[PDB]
Design a protein around this ligand. Structure first.
Ligand code: HEM
Length: 154
């Protein structure tokens, strides 16, 4: 489950590009999530009204939340294999106030991978893709562990 130093290095190489625009990457991640899995838009009372891609792109509220999402994920990724303190409140919030099944966390992992590949073809080769995939698997798995403790079957 754990990543090597070299795998983390690949993850943070591509994250270095994302960092220079957390809101804009985050917006594309949410859009690709919602369009690839429309059922996930149901979890977001604030965005359910957005019925088109162009509407989603014009939503400053959607853009802002994309920054929140990727800011939180960046802090986690930057902690590499010692992210217990950053991940725990996130798990807590997504197992209580917004009950997000692990399946949808897989969907957004998939959306993140697709956005990075579309926006960063050169820096996101097969090895960096495999490493980012692994980091997001570790992330979901660790969230799932906390879910169990919190009483939520994900
Ligand atoms: C990489 C995975 C994710 C990250 C890093 C993330 C991060 C966040 C953060 C930081 C917040 C606000 C603070 C908090 O609640 O702790 C939030 C809120 C929320 N999250 Fe997530 N999230 C992720 C995945 C998801 C998914 C897949 C869904 C639904 C399918 C979801 C649904 C929500 C909702 C509904 C809120 C509240 C929105 C609002 O403030 O109105 N999250 N998320």
């Amino acid at each position: 489950m754990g990543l090597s130093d070299g795998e983390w290095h690949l993850v943070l190489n591509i994250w270095g590009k994302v960092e220079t625009d957390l809101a804009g990457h985050g917006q594309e991640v949410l859009i690709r999530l919602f369009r690839s899995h429309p059922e996930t838009l149901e979890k977001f009372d604030k965005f359910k009204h957005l019925k088109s891609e162009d509407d989603m792109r014009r939503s400053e509220d959607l853009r802002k939340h994309g920054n929140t999402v990727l800011t939180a994920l960046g802090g986690i990724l930057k902690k590499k294999g010692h992210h217990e303190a950053e991940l725990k409140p996130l798990a807590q919030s997504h197992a209580t106030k917004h009950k997000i099944p692990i399946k949808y966390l897989e969907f957004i992992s998939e959306a993140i991978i697709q956005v990075l590949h579309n926006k960063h073809p050169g820096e996101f080769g097969a090895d960096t893709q495999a490493a980012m995939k692994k980091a997001l698997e570790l992330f979901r798995n660790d969230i799932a562990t906390k879910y169990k403790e919190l009483g939520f079957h994900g």
